[PDB]
Design a protein around this ligand. Structure first.
Ligand SMILES: Nc1cc(I)ccn1
Ligand SMILES: Nc1cc(I)ccn1
Ligand SMILES: Nc1cc(I)ccn1
Lengths: 262, 297
């Protein structure tokens, strides 16, 4: 019904496809940052996941925050000591954009252990706004995921959590996931979640929607399979912990499949 | 920064900031400036402004107020907007004796729907459609404005802020406390606005939420599971509601032809899922003969 905006799903999908190209971070930005690394970024995102659980934030907020960060770091050199400042400001902005009841700025200051003052946070907020030119409405993996779910028959909550879970894992590792568009990652997470729980693959109805085949999804699905396989061994764990809870059907605890049909 | 702008006069205050008509001293362009104060030691840039600016930057359509620039200081934000002569509420009030010509009404509704379809096509709910937020010029155009209460939505929709839409323009799904609402709530407002343009009185002028529902039911018929499946299972539905019969649209909007009345009813369907889309509305027979007349200003 209207909650799935049938007169608009198609135009919305087409628009997000165009927009996710616009809001795409620069693939190679980390090599151009003298003082920060993919490793440091992983620590940052992992921390944002915790923050997101402590404040019961929407998952969509977390994804938005990460888009903000990668685009900022595509334009601005940042020293290691200020990396967290950029992350706090992006989280703050994502919350203001997405949340009904964002946390107050004070709470954003508290979570950095008072590494930064309130004034630093607010000033960084404004700088972040200027660098992204207020282009904050960025398509996220989740925005594509929720639309792909509609193609299920019936709905399966395990497939839905699991895909969410794999999506968040991708946020952590700029290498390789900065090369993939949100919509590609979302498709690869949805295929991999579907295959793991049901057995079924990426449906024809979504091939027709997206133009993506299992062929064109092959590269991203291999990296995601790798990531899924290696997950319990990742230095960053907050996502695995998060997705143990009944809230997410404990999907993180599911043994991943060992191969695909390729 | 604002060196090139000369203030001319105050023109009021939206959901946030304060609005001036101004003149670009170099180009001669007349604009509206929205001054938004930045809480630089406390809350920073208001979420209202983050949503308005970000969504209006994406929304480029002839029937959506054009945001020309955003001028930064450390202490203030000025949004620069194309200037429009006045809002529809002021126009209606001015037209209280003389009435508004039906072709102008039809033109304006058609334009409002074009603007709104663009919003929905770009995953944005407006959530504050009322005459005061609709701007007209001297050449017969009308445009959606004040996107401070707007929201970029996902598909499918999730739970958003409930305290939304000015009471009189608020859809029964929001009133009855529903978990989810969608593009339908904007169509309801436009329905209310359509009726208001025809009579120049608000359709459902309530004093309270309970009074609001009573006003809607008494005119459209009290809904049941037949008209609106799931209505009686609604959070704030009350079994005890009086059961009124639907009022004929001959009484409701006398001036309106059979086509207008059909479009209006479809806009005010109780069931959100049957409420007509702005997209579909653009095709309705009411607009077969639509023209673009100039208002009498
Ligand atoms: N500094 C300013 C402010 C306004 I409002 C208009 C022009 N200059
Ligand atoms: N009169 C006005 C007001 C705004 I906000 C934008 C344009 N014209
Ligand atoms: N607005 C109204 C009308 C009646 I008749 C009863 C209650 N409220």
């Amino acid at each position: 019904g209207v909650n799935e905006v049938p007169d608009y799903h198609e135009d919305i999908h087409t628009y997000l496809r165009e927009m996710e190209v616009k809001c795409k971070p620069k693939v190679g930005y980390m090599k151009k940052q003298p003082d920060i690394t993919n490793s440091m970024r992983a620590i940052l995102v992992d921390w944002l996941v915790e923050v997101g659980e402590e404040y019961k934030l929407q998952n969509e907020t977390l994804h938005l925050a990460v888009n903000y960060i990668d685009r900022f770091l595509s334009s601005m050199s940042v020293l290691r000591g200020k990396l967290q400042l950029v992350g706090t400001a992006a989280m703050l902005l994502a919350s203001k954009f997405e949340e009904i009841y964002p946390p107050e700025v004070a709470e954003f200051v508290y979570i950095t252990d008072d590494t930064y003052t309130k004034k630093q946070v607010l000033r960084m907020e404004h700088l972040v706004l200027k660098v992204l030119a207020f282009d904050l409405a960025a398509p996220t993996i989740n925005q594509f995921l929720t639309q792909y779910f509609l193609h299920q028959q019936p709905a399966n909550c395990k497939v839905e959590s699991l895909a969410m879970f794999l999506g968040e894992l991708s946020l952590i590792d700029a290498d390789p996931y900065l090369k993939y568009l949100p919509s590609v990652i979302a498709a690869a997470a949805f295929h991999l979640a579907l295959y793991t729980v049901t057995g079924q693959s990426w449906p024809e109805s979504l091939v027709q929607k997206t133009g993506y085949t299992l062929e064109t999804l092959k590269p991203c699905l291999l990296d995601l399979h790798q990531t899924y396989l290696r997950a319990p061994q990742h230095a960053q764990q907050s996502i695995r912990e998060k997705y143990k809870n009944s809230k997410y059907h404990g999907v993180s605890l599911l043994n991943p499949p060992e191969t695909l049909n390729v | 920064s604002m060196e090139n702008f000369q203030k001319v006069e105050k023109i009021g205050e939206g959901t946030y900031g304060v609005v001036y008509k101004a003149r670009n001293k170099l180009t001669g362009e007349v604009v509206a400036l929205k001054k938004i104060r930045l809480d630089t030691e406390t809350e920073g840039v208001p979420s209202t402004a983050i949503r308005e600016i970000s969504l209006l930057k994406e929304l480029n359509h002839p029937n959506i107020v054009k945001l020309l620039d955003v001028i930064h200081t450390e202490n203030k934000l000025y949004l620069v907007f194309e200037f429009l002569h006045q809002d529809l509420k002021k126009f209606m009030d001015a037209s209280a004796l003389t009435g508004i010509p039906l072709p102008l009404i039809k033109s304006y509704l058609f334009q409002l729907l074009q603007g709104l379809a663009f919003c929905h096509s770009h995953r944005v709910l407006h959530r504050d459609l009322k005459p005061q937020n609709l701007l007209i010029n001297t050449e017969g155009a009308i445009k959606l404005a004040d996107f401070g209460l707007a929201r970029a939505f996902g598909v499918p929709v999730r739970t958003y802020t409930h305290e939304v839409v000015t009471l009189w323009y608020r859809a029964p799904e929001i009133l009855l406390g529903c978990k989810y609402y969608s593009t339908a709530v904007d169509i309801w407002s436009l329905g209310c606005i359509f009726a208001e343009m025809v009579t120049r009185r608000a359709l459902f002028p309530g004093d309270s939420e309970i009074d609001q529902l009573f006003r809607i039911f008494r005119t459209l018929g009290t809904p049941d599971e037949v008209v609106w499946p799931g209505v009686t299972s609604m959070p704030d539905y009350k079994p005890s509601f009086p059961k009124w019969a639907r009022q004929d649209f001959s009484k409701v909007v006398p001036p309106l032809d059979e086509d207008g009345r059909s479009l209006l009813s479809q806009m005010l369907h109780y069931d959100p899922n049957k409420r007509i889309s702005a997209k579909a509305a653009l095709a309705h027979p009411f607009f077969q003969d639509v023209t673009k007349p100039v208002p009498h200003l």
